[PDB]
Swiss-Prot record, chain B:
Location of this chain's protein in the cell: Virion
Whole sequence portion shown: 70 to 138 of 688
Domain of life: Viruses
Assembly with partners or alone: Homotrimer. Interacts with baseplate hub protein pb3. Interacts with receptor-binding protein pb5.
Role of this protein: Together with BHP-pb3, forms the central straight fiber, bearing the receptor binding protein RBP-pb5 at its C-terminus. Upon RBP-pb5 binding to the host receptor FhuA, the central fiber reorganizes and undergoes structural rearrangements that lead to its bending, bringing BHP-pb3 close to the host membrane for anchoring.
Name of the featured protein: Straight fiber protein pb4
Amino acid sequence: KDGSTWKQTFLIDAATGAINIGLLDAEGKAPISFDPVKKIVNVDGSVITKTINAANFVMTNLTGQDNPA
Amino acid sequence: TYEVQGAFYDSIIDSELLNAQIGINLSDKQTFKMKSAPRITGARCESEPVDVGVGAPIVYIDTTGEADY
């Protein structure tokens, strides 16, 4: 409850197993997003894990002026 | 290209006499080539399409100069 309105914090859709986590940005960009339809886990920010196993560490220039490395 | 010839003129040598170059006993001439300023032949910019993210802008510009740096 923010004043007279309510801001979404987290959503869990029935049709799609999408779980957005976090207060929405002014432009509507959720911090953490999910999509089983595309089989992607989308996290804006950082990820900390003891280890990671994968088959393709494909660095990307996600931002306009980023430096993948 | 220019040719260089000169020498020292003492207190005896006068401005008019120096212009006449009679008693100066100047040095033998020497010819050298004067370099050329840089110029840009063409201006362009291309970048690679990317599946995910954004292609990093790059500038390709072709010169024709001869400056050391």
